[PDB]
Amino acid sequence: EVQLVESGGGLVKAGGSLILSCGVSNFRISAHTMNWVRRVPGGGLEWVASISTSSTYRDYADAVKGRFTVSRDDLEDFVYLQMHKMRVEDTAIYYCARKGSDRLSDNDPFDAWGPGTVVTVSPASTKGPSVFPLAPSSKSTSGGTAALGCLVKDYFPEPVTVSWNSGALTSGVHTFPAVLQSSGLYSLSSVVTVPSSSLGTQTYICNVNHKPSNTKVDKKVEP
Amino acid sequence: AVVMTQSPSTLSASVGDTITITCRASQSIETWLAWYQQKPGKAPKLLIYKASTLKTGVPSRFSGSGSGTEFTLTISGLQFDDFATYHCQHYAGYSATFGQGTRVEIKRTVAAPSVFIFPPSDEQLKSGTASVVCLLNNFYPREAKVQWKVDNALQSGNSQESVTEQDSKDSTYSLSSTLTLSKADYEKHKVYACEVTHQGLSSPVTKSFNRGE
Numbered sequence: 001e002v003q004l005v006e007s008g009g010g011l012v013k014a015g016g017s018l019i020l021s022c023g024v025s026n027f028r029i030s031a032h033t034m035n036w037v038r039r040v041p042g043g044g045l046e047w048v049a050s051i052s053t054s055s056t057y058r059d060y061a062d063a064v065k066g067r068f069t070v071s072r073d074d075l076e077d078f079v080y081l082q083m084h085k086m087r088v089e090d091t092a093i094y095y096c097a098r099k100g101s102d103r104l105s106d107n108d109p110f111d112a113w114g115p116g117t118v119v120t121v122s123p124a125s126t127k128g129p130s131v132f133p134l135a136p137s138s139k140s141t142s143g144g145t146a147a148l149g150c151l152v153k154d155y156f157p158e159p160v161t162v163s164w165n166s167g168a169l170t171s172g173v174h175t176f177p178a179v180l181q182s183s184g185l186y187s188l189s190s191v192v193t194v195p196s197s198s199l200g201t202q203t204y205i206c207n208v209n210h211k212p213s214n215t216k217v218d219k220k221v222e223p
Numbered sequence: 224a225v226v227m228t229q230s231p232s233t234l235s236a237s238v239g240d241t242i243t244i245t246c247r248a249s250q251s252i253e254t255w256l257a258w259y260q261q262k263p264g265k266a267p268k269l270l271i272y273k274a275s276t277l278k279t280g281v282p283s284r285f286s287g288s289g290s291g292t293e294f295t296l297t298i299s300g301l302q303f304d305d306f307a308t309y310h311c312q313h314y315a316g317y318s319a320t321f322g323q324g325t326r327v328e329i330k331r332t333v334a335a336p337s338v339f340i341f342p343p344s345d346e347q348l349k350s351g352t353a354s355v356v357c358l359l360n361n362f363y364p365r366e367a368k369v370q371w372k373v374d375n376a377l378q379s380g381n382s383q384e385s386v387t388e389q390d391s392k393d394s395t396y397s398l399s400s401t402l403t404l405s406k407a408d409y410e411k412h413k414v415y416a417c418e419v420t421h422q423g424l425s426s427p428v429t430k431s432f433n434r435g436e
């Protein structure tokens with residue numbers, strides 16, 4: 001009859017944050033100390049955090065202290081777990097659990113548990129971009145002008161910086177705002193227009209810098 | 224149930240101009256109206272509250288007026304710092320409602336986009352993905368429509384757009400549209416077309432290529 005249900009979950013890159021919530025049915029949380037527990041991939045359970053009635057005492061596993069926060073909402077019956085600076089070892093199924101028994105005492109077991117929500121922390125906090133040419137052709141000519149560029153794909157987090165020819169080429173450069181792809185990674189293109197007559201008279205190199213991953217890529221764009 | 228209506232939604236002007244932005248309420252709101260300034264990627268900043276009271280730190284070239292159902296933000300002597308979006312807001316004890324925003328930009332003449340298309344690189348293709356890029360360059364005003372057609376079948380759900388901030392030298396915008404296909408899907412079709420509609424184009428302009436040619 002009593003039920004709990006966790007919401008939030010899924011994939012987080014190392015160093016990231018994720019917030020979980022717990023809602024309930026057929027009881028009021030106000031009477032109960034509420035807990036978060038997790039089941040790690042090796043199969044064992046780990047107590048994560050406890051929050052007492054009226055929030056007077058909040059307690060945390062050593063492994064998460066200073067990174068996790070538990071809160072409660074007694075009027076609408078929710079418990080929250082904020083998780084920050086997440087680590088691979090945080091990867092687990094997370095359950096909210098009530099401390100309780102048929103008759104309440106000063107120290108009861110966990111009598112009711114949610115079904116769990118899976119939280120996965122990927123080890124890579126950063127990912128350097130892949131850089132592809134946007135090659136000039138008759139299809140990227142308009143009037144006496146040619147366009148060329150670099151597609152800077154699949155990096156995380158922002159930002160990347162893009163120069164052209166080590167900073168010697170700045171006129172006619174547009175570096176677009178990044179877009180978040182459904183993959184969770186960023187992409188942008190940097191383009192430059194030049195006279196069609198300058199093609200073949202020099203090289204064009206985009207210099208891509210991704211500070212967060214300490215990745216630098218130079219890409220030559222021809223013809 | 225209070226609805227706020229802001230006009231115009233885009234306002235194009237020059238440095239030194241005096242401009243007026245209007246916000247009207249669907250029912251009387253006394254003087255319970257605020258104005259915020261917002262720059263791209265930043266938080267809104269409160270400028271004026273109770274219709275006419277400037278927040279500390281706000282230069283006197285901003286002024287708010289009005290009461291009841293009609294309110295005005297006036298900026299007297301536009302500076303570069305003032306090009307931004309302005310939002311009006313009715314605020315009550317337990318709710319608020321905003322106007323739709325007014326984006327204040329630099330005025331210039333209509334300029335058609337120059338359109339450019341880029342097939343995926345052979346390098347990218349090897350790794351299983353095809354990004355097809357259409358560039359709309361140096362156009363004004365910012366409103367523009369791009370449609371992708373693959374063997375004349377209109378595409379939906381598989382492209383993303385990005386637009387630049389207004390250019391500091393020629394006051395134009397540029398836009399990229401990127402079509403992303405699996406290599407498998409890409410190799411199923413021949414003609415890839417970017418069709419562009421813009422006020423400066425008498426009829427829409429299509430740039431296309433044939434895969435592999």
Ligand SMILES: CO[C@H]1O[C@H]([C@H](C)O)[C@@H](O)[C@H](O)[C@@H]1O
Pocket residue numbers: 031032033034052053099100101104105106107108
């Ligand atoms: C107030 O009683 C609550 O808190 C108790 C302790 C103090 O956590 C616990 O044993 C009870 O089951 C209940 O959750």
Ligand SMILES: [Cl-]
Pocket residue numbers: 039040041091092093118119
């Ligand atoms: Cl797991």
Ligand SMILES: [Cl-]
Pocket residue numbers: 100101102111
């Ligand atoms: Cl029991």
Ligand SMILES: [Cl-]
Pocket residue numbers: 110111112113
């Ligand atoms: Cl149980």
Ligand SMILES: [Cl-]
Pocket residue numbers: 120121122123
């Ligand atoms: Cl992983």
Ligand SMILES: [Cl-]
Pocket residue numbers: 170171172
């Ligand atoms: Cl320049």
Ligand SMILES: [Cl-]
Pocket residue numbers: 209210211212214215216
């Ligand atoms: Cl770097």
Ligand SMILES: [Cl-]
Pocket residue numbers: none
């Ligand atoms: Cl300030």
Ligand SMILES: [Cl-]
Pocket residue numbers: 261262263306307308326327
């Ligand atoms: Cl803006």
Ligand SMILES: [Cl-]
Pocket residue numbers: 142336337338428
């Ligand atoms: Cl064109």
Ligand SMILES: [Cl-]
Pocket residue numbers: 142145193337360361
């Ligand atoms: Cl151009």
Ligand SMILES: [Cl-]
Pocket residue numbers: 179181187382383401403
């Ligand atoms: Cl994209």
